[PDB]
Amino acid sequence: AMLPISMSDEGDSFLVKDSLGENKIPKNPSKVVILDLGILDTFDALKLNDKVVGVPAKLPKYLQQFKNKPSVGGVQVDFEAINALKPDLIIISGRQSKFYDKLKEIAPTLFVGLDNANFLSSFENNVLSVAKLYGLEKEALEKISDIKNEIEKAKSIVDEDKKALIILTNSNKISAFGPQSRFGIIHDVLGINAVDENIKVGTAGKSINSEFILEKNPDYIFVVDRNVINKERAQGILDNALVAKTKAAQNKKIIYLDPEYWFLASGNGLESLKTMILEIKNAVK
């Protein structure tokens, strides 16, 4: 299990430990550089927009209120821009853990990792830890309750005898993903059963083809199409007689998920996580 963020109050600051290291973070930080899009959404949802001084502007359609913040990268980190903003806090997730030592020379750097084996507990701890910095625990607990209620509404309507498959299409490559993966919340949080519970743990997933999809005969197929960031599109990759024969194709349950949520992994967002939960619920209702 990923080590959680723990914080102890030391008056003007918190002593913060997370899986990457320890930091003294000032209370109410006022110049925050955020490289994780999900946590940027949570800043919005907690009304902390004025605390943010840098984002990866090179930005999905749901985060356009930050389009005029100074750019610190693309998700490609620009260290010069970061230093020149003189931040009092840098927030990162998985995709930037490789940059940790360099960012930490600039300013205290908080890791809000999403644990693919314990998604909801990581999500809660990330949101509540950011809130504690600002004394917003009450407000963050109300919104965390809203998301839990949405998960319960979504779970309530899932069919126990149907099975789904998750795939990522990248140009013409198809790769399968299962429980406890980067897309795992379809199986792990919303309880939708998988066609294969034993695809191997790892970020690149398992290479598959249409024969595989036919062999599994999924009731639903969830597609994360990284071609939508061209020409070739999952719909054409799956435009064939193998995929056509599948229960998913026959009942028009090939679901194309918005990659600006799923591929960019905005699970740390109070509002973005909600939109993802609703997107699943509305596909299988």
Residue numbers in the entry: 22 to 79, 81 to 97, 99 to 252, 255 to 310
Excerpt from the paper describing this PDB structure:
The periplasmic binding protein (PBP) CeuE1 is an important component of the Fe(III) uptake system in Campylobacter jejuni, a commensal Gram-negative bacterium in the avian gut, but a common source of food poisoning in humans. CeuE, an integral part of the CeuBCDE ABC transporter of C. jejuni, is responsible for capturing Fe(III)-siderophore complexes in the periplasm for delivery to their respective inner membrane transporter. C. jejuni does not itself synthesize siderophores, but capitalizes on their secretion by other bacteria, such as E. coli. Here we report a combined solution and structural study of a series of synthetic tetradentate analogues of the enterobactin-derived bis(2, 3-dihydroxybenzoyl-L-Ser), to explore the ligand-binding promiscuity of CeuE, both wild type and with mutations of the Fe(III) binding residues H227 and Y288.
